[PDB]
Design a protein around this ligand. Structure first.
Ligand SMILES: CCCCCCCCO[C@@H]1O[C@H](CO)[C@@H](O)[C@H](O)[C@H]1O
Lengths: 260, 284
């Protein structure tokens, strides 16, 4: 129980990582750089194979660039899928309904690391097994694992260096806070409105989306890596859960969302 | 001419006062519904009532569509008509389709003890679903409509069971004709290089997905006047993969290329959707 260091070291330190990302659709070669001048962070993610796609951070100004396209910027707090989002976790408020297991130390990229496991108390969310570096405290490898124990997504380092709805979910994994809500129109001929409620437990996030049921709305269950799209049809509504949640759970959140 | 009948069906559904008790059939099951319609002051009046289970009701008064249901707050939205009530085919400007579709008469038959003109609506390029229409010879109102996939299998059926055309406006349409009715550009870096003949861009919109990083997704709604589908493009995620799911008139095609997750949603044969996706260019 001391990832907080890895957390601070990743944000408050200068470095470079020539890591790879492995999932069910390939293994890609990347690279991430960090820094912090006047307390403002600096990042940079690059694709070493094929198109020189790039992404950079600056305070809250992430910008995208790549061959043959017009650049642009978005407002964010840190580049996602550039480094395990486990990095920015606010553990002090997470620990209450969480628990961190110590699990020996090993070698990740010719370095001595300290393996640590993260888990939800109730066992509703996914799981993480991180390999922190002894020296720097910078993560060398983080694995997302499903309840079973398989790796949904692997972050491996290769070289170090320095508004108002009519519905309400009556059941949440204890730890998630309704980060927001919104009601935008679907891109249909009838501008069908869909209401959304974004959640998060400090680590994982998922959305609950609702639209009037239609004659083609059917219960579906699709999971790819850390993306789980669960649809359920009942009470004249089409409920879609999207996020880092095992099916069993998503399906449960959509079954306790009562209307009045 | 067939095209003229389809044209007539269109007007009768908008001008006459009538009540249709019908069913909606698909994989999901059979739905019992009643549709009441009336024209008052050159203004649409209608109610769609789910006859079974909870009393769900929808109503049209001009360009307002109010949704009533027990145990929930009534509300209103804008709309030119109630979706999934009468077959949307009825509101089609067939003149616009004539150069792309064949309106083939298939003869006559009975439906709900009434004589009907049987017409087949088919897109000549073979890229789309087709329809079959059973029209009530006397009133021109639709008695049955079948959405068929390219192989001829029924994806959805509308069928009238009980029918009535009224010279006067019923008491319920009147009660509706004035009541406590509840309150209520973009430019993308991509372009679908290939589209079946007849489809045109109806709208476009960039909005943030309900994620933690407010990931942007761009949408383009297309229509040829009868069928519709949208092309949505968001930043490719490491969790993005090719998929194809069809359920009735809804096809959800997802492709992944050039760092973009492409999702086609709408009334299209899986093959047309894939082709549209595979032909989207970026810049240059
Ligand atoms: C980016 C994701 C967009 C999803 C848009 C879903 C739009 C569903 O739209 C609905 O589809 C039904 C068939 O499924 C039709 O029967 C309904 O009439 C139509 O309004």
């Amino acid at each position: 129980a001391l990832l907080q260091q890895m957390n601070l070291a990743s944000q408050s330190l200068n470095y470079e990582l020539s890591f790879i990302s492995i999932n069910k659709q390939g293994v890609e070669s990347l690279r991430y750089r960090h820094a912090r001048l006047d307390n403002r962070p600096l990042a940079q993610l690059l694709q070493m194979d094929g198109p020189r796609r790039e992404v950079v951070q600056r305070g809250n100004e992430i910008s995208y660039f790549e061959p043959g396209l017009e650049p642009f910027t978005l407002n964010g707090d840190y580049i996602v899928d550039s480094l395990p989002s486990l990095i920015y976790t606010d553990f002090k408020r997470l620990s209450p309904y969480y628990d961190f297991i110590s699990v020996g130390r090993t070698r990740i990229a010719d370095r001595l690391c300290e393996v640590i496991r993260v888990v939800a108390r109730d066992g509703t969310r996914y799981s993480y097994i991180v390999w922190m570096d002894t020296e720097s405290k910078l993560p060398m490898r983080v694995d997302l694992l499903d309840r079973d124990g398989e790796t949904l997504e692997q972050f491996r380092v290769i070289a170090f260096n320095v508004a108002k709805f009519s519905w309400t979910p009556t059941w949440l994994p204890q730890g998630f806070s309704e980060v927001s809500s919104s009601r935008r129109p679907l891109p249909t001929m009838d501008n069908m409105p869909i209401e959304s409620r974004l959640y998060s437990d400090g680590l994982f996030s998922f959305s609950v989306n609702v639209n009037r049921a239609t004659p083609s709305s059917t219960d579906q269950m699709l999971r790819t890596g850390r993306r789980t799209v669960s649809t359920s049809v009942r009470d004249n509504a089409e409920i879609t859960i999207v996020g880092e949640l095992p099916p069993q759970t998503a399906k449960r959140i959509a079954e306790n969302i009562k209307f009045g």
